[PDB]
Amino acid sequence: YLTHQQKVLRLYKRALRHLESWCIHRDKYRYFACLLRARFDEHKNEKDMVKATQLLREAEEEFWHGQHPQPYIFPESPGGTSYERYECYKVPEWCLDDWHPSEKAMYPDYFAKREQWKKLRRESWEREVKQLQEETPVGGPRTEALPPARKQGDLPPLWWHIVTRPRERPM
């Protein structure tokens, strides 16, 4: 899905990046970029949805034979050089529950704060369980979204892992 509105927009970003790879130098890219913009704005006012789709059919087909064989990919993005590079250093937080007490003495203050955070999760869970139950449309939720908290001092449902996920560059 994504509707003809989004589907066309994505092509714009994807087509631009490939162009940026092909032309290499910024100046040539900028000039050749503006030409690209013109082709997009030309049919931006087409009010025939049936015709609008046909523009996309040929538009993508044109792109398929314009794509740079090696398009530039951001280093830390999927398919990039550094993608998943640091996943070895990311250790999930629950591993700290197994530390030897002698080790935990080395970091007293942090572990003390951890106990506070753990207590928050345990108490909030029962409340968090209810909130999803009542809002849930019988027959299973139809979408993957979640509802924000509806009371003071109540945390949004299912917040532990999003909050405590390992940092981007742990070490």
């Binding site: 509105q5 989004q6 927009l9 994505r10 714009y12 970003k13 631009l16 990046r17 913009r37 997009f40 704005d41 931006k44 951001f74 280093p75 830390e76 993005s77």
Partner: peptide, 27 residues
């Protein structure tokens, strides 16, 4: 600004910090 121009703003921001913003979340 058009929605198109909204795309071009995003593509600029990627280069300021050098890390892609996924298509779905850019919208």
């Amino acid at each position: 600004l058009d929605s198109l121009d909204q795309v071009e703003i995003i593509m600029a921001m990627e280069d300021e910090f050098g890390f892609e913003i996924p298509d779905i979340d850019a919208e």
